């Protein structure tokens, strides 16, 4: 099996170490996941000390946080559009960490309407008081508002789905948003 040790590598001086031991179980590795979208498959794997490890595959929906608001909703995933490690993961549509993807934007829009009462794109006393008090904070910036017009929002995956069975992440805002739109637009 895939080893994880350094008795098979070279030393730092440039010397092939000799074969001294056989491979172990406390030095192993395992194959990548190559996690995809649609028709949720989660195989679990027995690890060192019991301690199961839900190897994600084919994962359709995930959790996503909006950090300026501190909220976290379940959403679909359109697809990945940027990955720093490999454009191959972008093309072949394989979910991993740090992965820039697009999400439905409908729970955030409808939550915004229910929470602040302010339209996007294009009565009772209690809800009116709630929205009037929560005003002066519906002014986030141009890029996220435009993305809510489009109905497809850029998120960064911050989970490790092949290790957790959860594609979880957070919406991009401001600085890194501008950085990633610059990286995307380079033609």
């Amino acid at each position: 099996g895939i080893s994880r040790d350094s008795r098979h590598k070279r030393s730092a001086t440039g010397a092939k170490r000799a074969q001294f031991r056989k491979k172990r179980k406390f030095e192993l590795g395992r194959q990548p996941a190559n996690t995809k979208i649609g028709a949720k498959r989660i195989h679990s794997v027995r690890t060192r000390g019991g301690n199961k490890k839900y190897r994600a595959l084919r994962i359709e929906t995930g959790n996503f946080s909006w950090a300026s608001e501190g909220i976290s909703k379940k959403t679909r995933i359109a697809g990945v559009v940027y990955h720093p490690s490999n454009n191959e993961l972008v093309r072949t549509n394989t979910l991993t960490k740090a992965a820039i993807v697009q999400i439905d934007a409908t729970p955030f829009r409808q939550w915004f309407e229910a929470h602040y009462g302010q339209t996007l794109g294009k009565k009772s006393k209690n809800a009116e008081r709630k929205w009037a008090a929560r005003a002066a904070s519906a002014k986030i910036e141009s890029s996220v508002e435009s993305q809510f017009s489009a109905g497809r929002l850029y998120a960064c995956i911050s989970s490790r789905p092949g290790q957790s069975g959860r594609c979880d992440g957070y919406i991009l805002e401001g600085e890194e948003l501008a950085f990633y739109l610059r990286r995307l637009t380079a033609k």
Binding site: S6, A12, E141
Partner: protein
């Protein structure tokens, strides 16, 4: 150390969410920590625009264990250098010593500017790479 966003990825300090809603002083935030053992986190690390998660001060690499001192001999690597540990091994039969050296490589932050010959002391941190275990914490030249 000219450009903080040199790499394709978005280098930042994890979990340090600079919130656009609150409008407080010092517009972007930066975590840090005193490494301990009587060392000082320099003002260049505080004021720095860099990230370097492998740095002991702003980063996440706790210094703990052995501490060593040596003179720098390499700088030709990216945020990593090599020093030389000159010491004297004793021979009882002949009852006298002999010079020996061990070229430990160490990691260095943008918080330090190190040229060759600059004696420096470092600290044992976790394995940074195949070759490295140590990280620079004090320099003793200019």
């Amino acid at each position: 150390e000219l450009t903080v966003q040199s790499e394709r990825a978005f280098q930042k300090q994890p979990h340090i969410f600079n919130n656009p809603k609150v409008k407080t002083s010092k517009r972007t935030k930066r975590w840090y920590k005193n490494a301990g053992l009587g060392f000082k986190t320099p003002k260049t690390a505080i004021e720095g625009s860099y990230i370097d998660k492998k740095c002991p001060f702003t980063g996440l690499v706790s210094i703990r264990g052995k501490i060593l001192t040596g003179t720098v001999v390499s700088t030709k690597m990216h945020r990593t250098i090599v020093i030389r540990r000159a010491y004297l091994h004793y021979i009882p039969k002949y009852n006298r010593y002999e010079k020996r050296h061990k070229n430990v490589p160490v990691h260095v932050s943008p918080a330090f500017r190190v040229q060759v010959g600059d004696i420096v002391t470092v600290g044992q941190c976790r394995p940074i790479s195949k070759t490295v275990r140590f990280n620079v914490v004090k320099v003793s030249a200019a």
